[PDB]
Amino acid sequence: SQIRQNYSTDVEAAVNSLVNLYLQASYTYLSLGFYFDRDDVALEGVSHFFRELAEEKREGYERLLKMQNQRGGRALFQDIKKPAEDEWGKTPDAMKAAMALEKKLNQALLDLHALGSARTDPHLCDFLETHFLDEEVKLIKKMGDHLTNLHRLGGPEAGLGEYLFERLTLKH
Amino acid sequence: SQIRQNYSTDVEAAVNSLVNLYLQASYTYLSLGFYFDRDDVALEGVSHFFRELAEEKREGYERLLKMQNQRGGRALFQDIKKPAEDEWGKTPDAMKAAMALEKKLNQALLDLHALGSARTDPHLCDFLETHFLDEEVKLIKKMGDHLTNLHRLGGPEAGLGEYLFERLTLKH
Amino acid sequence: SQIRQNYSTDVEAAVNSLVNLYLQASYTYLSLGFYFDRDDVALEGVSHFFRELAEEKREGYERLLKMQNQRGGRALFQDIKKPAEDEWGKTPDAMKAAMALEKKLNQALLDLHALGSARTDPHLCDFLETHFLDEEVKLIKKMGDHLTNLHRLGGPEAGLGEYLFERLTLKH
Amino acid sequence: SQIRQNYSTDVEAAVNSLVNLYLQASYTYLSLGFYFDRDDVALEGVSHFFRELAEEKREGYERLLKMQNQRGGRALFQDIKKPAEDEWGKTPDAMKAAMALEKKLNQALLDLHALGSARTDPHLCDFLETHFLDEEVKLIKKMGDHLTNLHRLGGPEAGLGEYLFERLTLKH
Numbered sequence: 094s095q096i097r098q099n100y101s102t103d104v105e106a107a108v109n110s111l112v113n114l115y116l117q118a119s120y121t122y123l124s125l126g127f128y129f130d131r132d133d134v135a136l137e138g139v140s141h142f143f144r145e146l147a148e149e150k151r152e153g154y155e156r157l158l159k160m161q162n163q164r165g166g167r168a169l170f171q172d173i174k175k176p177a178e179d180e181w182g183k184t185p186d187a188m189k190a191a192m193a194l195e196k197k198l199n200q201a202l203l204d205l206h207a208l209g210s211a212r213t214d215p216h217l218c219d220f221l222e223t224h225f226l227d228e229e230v231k232l233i234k235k236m237g238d239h240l241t242n243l244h245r246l247g248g249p250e251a252g253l254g255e256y257l258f259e260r261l262t263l264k265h
Numbered sequence: 266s267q268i269r270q271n272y273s274t275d276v277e278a279a280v281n282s283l284v285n286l287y288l289q290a291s292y293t294y295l296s297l298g299f300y301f302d303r304d305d306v307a308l309e310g311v312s313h314f315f316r317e318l319a320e321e322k323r324e325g326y327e328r329l330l331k332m333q334n335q336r337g338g339r340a341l342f343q344d345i346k347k348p349a350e351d352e353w354g355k356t357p358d359a360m361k362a363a364m365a366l367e368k369k370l371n372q373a374l375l376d377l378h379a380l381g382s383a384r385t386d387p388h389l390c391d392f393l394e395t396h397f398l399d400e401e402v403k404l405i406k407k408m409g410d411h412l413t414n415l416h417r418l419g420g421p422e423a424g425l426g427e428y429l430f431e432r433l434t435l436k437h
Numbered sequence: 438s439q440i441r442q443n444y445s446t447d448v449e450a451a452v453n454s455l456v457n458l459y460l461q462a463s464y465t466y467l468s469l470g471f472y473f474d475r476d477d478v479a480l481e482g483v484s485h486f487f488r489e490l491a492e493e494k495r496e497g498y499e500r501l502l503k504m505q506n507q508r509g510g511r512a513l514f515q516d517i518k519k520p521a522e523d524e525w526g527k528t529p530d531a532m533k534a535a536m537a538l539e540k541k542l543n544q545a546l547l548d549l550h551a552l553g554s555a556r557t558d559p560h561l562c563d564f565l566e567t568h569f570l571d572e573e574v575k576l577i578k579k580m581g582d583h584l585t586n587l588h589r590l591g592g593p594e595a596g597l598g599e600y601l602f603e604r605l606t607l608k609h
Numbered sequence: 610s611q612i613r614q615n616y617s618t619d620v621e622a623a624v625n626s627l628v629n630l631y632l633q634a635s636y637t638y639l640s641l642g643f644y645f646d647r648d649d650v651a652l653e654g655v656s657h658f659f660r661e662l663a664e665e666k667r668e669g670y671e672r673l674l675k676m677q678n679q680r681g682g683r684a685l686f687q688d689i690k691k692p693a694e695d696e697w698g699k700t701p702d703a704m705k706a707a708m709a710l711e712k713k714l715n716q717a718l719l720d721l722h723a724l725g726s727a728r729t730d731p732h733l734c735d736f737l738e739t740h741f742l743d744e745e746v747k748l749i750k751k752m753g754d755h756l757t758n759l760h761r762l763g764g765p766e767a768g769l770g771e772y773l774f775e776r777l778t779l780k781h
């Protein structure tokens with residue numbers, strides 16, 4: 094590669110691996126998104142919330158593939174694993190799955206930052222910090238707040254709570 | 266002081282003391298404000314309500330310091346006492362703490378008015394009446410109304426009530 | 438905490454401690470600000486300079502408290518220490534106190550960066566670098582330039598120099 | 610008088626007396642104003658400063674005469690005493706005369722407030738507080754600040770200082 098400089102084979106492969114993880118998370122969010130528009134679930138605000146996240150994850154993998162080209166790495170694609178569940182249950186369940194998925198992406202991001210730091214690759218480190226890290230922290234905080242409000246709305250009165258949350262917090 | 270006229274040493278010191286009280290109330294409101302944005306509390310409308318009050322209290326101390334300069338008093342600063350609690354509980358609790366804090370400021374304002382009246386200082390009296398007294402009365406009334414609506418929303422159904430109040434009364 | 442990830446207890450406490458330092462610096466700037474509007478000092482441009490800095494420091498503590506919530510730390514408030522002097526002397530003196538105060542904040546910022554670097558927390562490191570470090574360096578440079586111009590205006594002709602500096606350099 | 614209510618003969622006469630004092634202060638400011646435009650003094654910014662004050666004093670006496678009509682008092686005019694000096698010296702001297710004149714008006718205002726308070730006439734008290742008291746305090750503060758800056762510009766270098774003050778502080 095005529096352009097490749099300070100770009101380790103380890104980062105390259107771990108970037109490809111993070112790309113597969115983003116593709117998979119996107120796929121998960123697509124499934125959550127359509128799930129909540131089923132006639133027998135019908136929570137459009139929740140559907141929208143998840144569709145948006147599918148879309149932000151695709152931007153993630155796209156930005157990771159562009160950066161691969163820019164550093165002169167070579168993208169390598171693997172199969173994308175189907176989402177972990179076929180039905181997602183109620184809003185609090187789905188939001189807890191989404192939380193767990195974002196924590197795993199965040200950990201993979203922190204892991205890739207540590208690797209790049211170890212291979213003294215400050216371009217890769219700051220690319221991750223300016224385009225991925227701050228955004229994860231903001232999104233996880235939002236999901237925590239959502240979970241707190243779903244819980245304050247739970248207990249016996251749960252169906253009503255789910256309706257109110259979708260109507261008064263989520264965007265439709 | 267070349268400008269000082271009809272400005273008693275007692276008013277001067279009591280103004281400095283009221284400044285410390287406003288600084289402390291601001292500090293309290295800052296703490297309430299961030300408290301309600303914790304991921305495990307997550308009531309943005311309540312957070313905003315308290316952040317706004319932190320800000321109005323700062324204007325209070327600023328207006329009191331300007332008036333000190335204008336009369337030719339000398340400001341004297343003391344340490345600012347940390348807020349009285351580290352956790353503020355639920356919306357009704359916090360609103361009751363806020364009520365109690367505004368009553369204490371109002372009493373200190375009325376006390377300073379009586380002192381200025383006693384020292385025949387009509388500039389100070391009307392400064393307090395045009396910039397502080399009317400505003401306290403309006404704010405305490407609002408807090409009373411909030412407390413009435415939180416109570417009408419309380420009982421067994423309390424979590425839901427707190428959610429509705431934050432969503433349908435408070436500004437976000 | 439449902440959201441807390443890669444956020445050490447040490448950073449958390451040192452953030453709370455940096456918050457107290459910003460609150461205190463704000464307080465110092467408030468005192469400088471009113472001091473320079475005393476009828477017997479009367480340097481409005483210097484007053485304005487310090488009032489602005491009080492305001493930028495408050496933004497600092499506010500941004501630090503928001504980041505605490507976002508990472509899922511818990512804010513803890515302590516008393517705020519009164520400013521170190523009651524009278525600030527002439528413009529060069531005050532500007533030298535302000536310089537010394539900014540160096541201490543900068544050192545505390547660098548100290549917190551080193552700690553976060555030691556605990557491999559790149560979110561915290563870059564938060565500090567993008568919102569605090571560059572701004573300190575710019576502000577200290579400005580204060581150095583001010584001190585150089587106050588000195589070039591000093592010597593026997595000092596009163597006149599102070600007047601000219603306030604009128605021709607500072608904003609009013 | 611068909612309209613007169615709660616309006617004591619004492620207030621009435623003291624209002625007429627305060628009118629004479631405002632007429633006299635206006636007259637003083639007229640004299641200061643033209644003095645500073647003499648070819649051999651030639652400080653246009655100082656001239657303007659005093660002309661403006663002549664004008665604000667006339668508004669004072671006009672507002673006092675209107676209030677006399679409104680309460681159903683009867684205006685009584687006396688001769689207006691010529692200003693106390695024919696030459697006003699240098700800017701600091703004139704500004705000190707102006708300071709002394711504003712303190713005497715302020716004392717007469719406070720005296721009339723006390724009298725109205727003694728005769729339980731709250732209309733007269735608040736008329737004075739909303740249209741006269743706050744304005745005196747602001748003006749005396751400004752004059753103090755001017756005197757501080759003239760002094761910081763004084764000593765051996767006095768002619769230059771006077772020039773700079775007129776050019777860089779006063780409006781022209």
Ligand SMILES: [Fe+3]
Nearest residue numbers: 130135137140
């Ligand atoms: Fe639909």
Ligand SMILES: [Fe+3]
Nearest residue numbers: 130137140141
């Ligand atoms: Fe849809």
Ligand SMILES: [Fe+3]
Nearest residue numbers: 144145148149
């Ligand atoms: Fe979108």
Ligand SMILES: [Fe+3]
Nearest residue numbers: 141144145148
């Ligand atoms: Fe869309």
Ligand SMILES: [Fe+3]
Nearest residue numbers: 144145148149
């Ligand atoms: Fe879209």
Ligand SMILES: [Fe+3]
Nearest residue numbers: 149152224228
């Ligand atoms: Fe993004």
Ligand SMILES: [Fe+3]
Nearest residue numbers: 145146148149
């Ligand atoms: Fe988007």
Ligand SMILES: [Fe+3]
Nearest residue numbers: 148149152153
């Ligand atoms: Fe986007």
Ligand SMILES: [Fe+3]
Nearest residue numbers: 145148149152
């Ligand atoms: Fe987009």
Ligand SMILES: [Fe+3]
Nearest residue numbers: 159160162163
């Ligand atoms: Fe391109």
Ligand SMILES: [Fe+3]
Nearest residue numbers: 177178179180
């Ligand atoms: Fe299943």
Ligand SMILES: [Fe+3]
Nearest residue numbers: 218219222559
């Ligand atoms: Fe970095």
Ligand SMILES: [Fe+3]
Nearest residue numbers: 149152224228
């Ligand atoms: Fe974005």
Ligand SMILES: [Fe+3]
Nearest residue numbers: 238302309312
């Ligand atoms: Fe929030």
Ligand SMILES: [Fe+3]
Nearest residue numbers: 302309312313
């Ligand atoms: Fe907020």
Ligand SMILES: [Fe+3]
Nearest residue numbers: 316317320321
């Ligand atoms: Fe506001």
